[PDB]
Amino acid sequence: ATFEIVNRCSYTVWAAASKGDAALDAGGRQLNSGESWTINVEPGTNGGKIWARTDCYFDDSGSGICKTGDCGGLLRCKRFGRPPTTLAEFSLNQYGKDYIDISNIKGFNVPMNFSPTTRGCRGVRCAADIVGQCPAKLKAPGGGCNDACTVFQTSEYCCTTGKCGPTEYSRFFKRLCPDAFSYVLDKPTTVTCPGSSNYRVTFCPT
């Protein structure tokens, strides 16, 4: 499947793409404002994610640090990124269907649209000013708005027992971005697309 990743933000982002135990395609790349990066993701990929990283420094070996979404100091991510990270999540060719969503479960750094480029389903977007409006206790110094699990590490926020409810903090994310997951047991905002669809992830869509 083809994913075109587009940076419409006015600032540089370092895109990342991983399935948690391996890179997808090259795993990461710098995207200046306006740049587009096309990656190929193997059919049958389960549990893939794409995200943006901000304020990164890398040396010539591709080693360094980012203020949001750092994936163990690598340009080319093999593992998932450090919150806060707005996430584009997907599972492809699962019994004939692709499943896509955006998630704020690991916080929010950059606004995002995640849309098919082929026919037969809708896109999802979270493009509100979550950082600007972020509750004081969730604001990340490096930038971004953390989820409450990351900050407080409780059973209720992290849904450790598999029983948890919405909270004051999950409801903040949900109010600004209804079409994104706000906590682990949120009512799903997953979109079902035809198997073998293609997609575009746009950072800063508006």
User: Torsion angle, CA of 19/93/187/8, rounded to 10 degrees?
Assistant: 60
CA–CA gap between residue 183 and residue 145 (Å, rounded): 14
CA–CA gap between residue 88 and residue 98 (Å, rounded): 13
Q: Amino acid identity, residue 130?
A: I
Q: Which residues pair with 48 in a beta bridge?
A: 90
Please enumerate in sequence order all residues whose Cβ is within 8 A of that of 99, keeping only pairs 6 or more positions apart, or say none.
Answer: 90, 91, 190, 191, 192, 193
Closest CA to 88 of 19, 36, 25: 19
CA–CA gap between residue 93 and residue 116 (Å, rounded): 14
Q: What are phi and psi of 45, to 5 degrees?
A: -60, 125
How many other β-carbons are positioned within 10 Å of the β-carbon of residue 100? 25
Residue 11 CA, distance from chain mean position: 17
Q: Any idea what the Cα angle at residue 40 is, between residues 9 and 206, rounded to 5°?
A: 20
Question: In terms of DSSP bridges, do strands 97-103 and 87-94 run parallel, antiparallel, or are they unpaired?
Answer: antiparallel
For the segment(s) 1-206, the CATH number from 2.60.110.10, 3.40.50.11540, 4.10.91.20, 3.40.50.920 is 2.60.110.10
**Long-range contacts: 11-14, Cβ < 8 Å, 24+?**
11/54, 13/52, 13/53, 13/54, 13/110, 13/203, 14/52, 14/53, 14/54, 14/56, 14/58, 14/66, 14/69, 14/75
| H/E element, 156 | helix 155-158
